[PDB]
């Protein structure tokens, strides 16, 4: 068996579901380690496992010990990580903000959009709590938060998703699946064809999925947990695509026009 990374959220157990129970068929067997997404971001960087999801900002800064597979992964339009405050807000210059985890896409698209702040990194479910009670003055929020924020009493600043697309025309991408290059390219292409089965599987039969959902995500609401997959799986999870592609080359090319990735001639994907 292949050790497999990938957070507890509904999207990512969603996406997984079926491969890890031997619903799809796949090339090798797999051991899931799930894991908050800063912590396999961090593990990436020094190339712990053979398969991971991954920010795809974090995936910018292990390209020669990484390839991203084509399925598996989240981006799109409206999957945008959003800063949320107390009450509305001029600007984020000299404020602290709440992050989840410095190598993610969504501290990447933050700093993108605003260069004053103060960071406090901490895992993704202290953000709500600590806006509301005053430890800092703003949130960067991720997985679930999108739906829950209002019950901590909070408004949106910005939808950073939306602040890309305005600003590039492009869907955002998130996350990705990568493998280890070491794996062999063969090996590589057929876990990409069985993760793209495993998240066809999940589309056809939802259903089959949410007790594995429920058994990660114990803290969630069904109401929640069904917006969440709704929300975060969509076309892009079964293939990049074209638009993807040419998504995931823009936020690359931002990266190194800040000297935060180095460039590469290696193609981004399997
Ligand atoms: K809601």
Same mark, same amino acid.
């Given at each position: 068996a292949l050790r497999l990374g990938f957070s507890p959220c509904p999207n990512d157990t969603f996406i997984f579901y079926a491969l890890v129970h031997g619903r799809v068929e796949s090339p090798v067997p797999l051991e899931p380690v799930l894991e908050d997404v800063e912590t396999l971001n961090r593990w990436a960087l020094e190339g712990r496992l053979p398969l991971t999801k991954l920010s795809y900002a974090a995936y910018a800064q292990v390209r020669d010990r990484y390839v991203a597979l084509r399925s598996g992964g989240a981006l799109g339009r409206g999957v945008g990580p959003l800063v949320v405050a107390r009450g509305p807000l001029?600007?984020?210059?000299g404020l602290r903000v709440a992050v @989840? /985890? =410095?190598?993610?896409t969504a501290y990447f698209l933050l700093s993108l959009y605003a260069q004053g702040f103060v960071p406090v990194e901490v895992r993704y479910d202290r953000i709500l709590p600590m806006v509301a009670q005053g430890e800092v003055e703003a949130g960067l929020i991720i997985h679930e938060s999108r739906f829950t924020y @209002? =019950?901590? /009493?909070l408004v949106q600043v910005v939808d950073l998703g939306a602040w890309w697309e305005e600003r590039t025309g492009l869907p955002l991408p998130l996350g990705a699946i990568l493998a280890r290059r070491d794996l062999g390219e063969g090996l590589i292409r057929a876990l990409d064809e069985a993760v793209r089965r495993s998240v066809a599987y999940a589309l056809a039969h939802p259903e089959e999925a949410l007790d594995y959902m429920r058994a990660h995500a114990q803290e969630l609401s069904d109401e929640v947990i069904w917006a969440h997959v709704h929300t975060y799986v969509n076309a892009f999870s079964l293939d990049v695509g074209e638009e993807g592609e040419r998504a995931v080359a823009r936020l690359f090319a931002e990266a190194e026009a800040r000297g935060l990735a180095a460039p590469s001639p290696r193609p981004l994907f399997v």
């Open positions: 001029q600007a984020l210059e @989840p /985890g =410095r190598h993610t @209002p =019950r901590y /009493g």
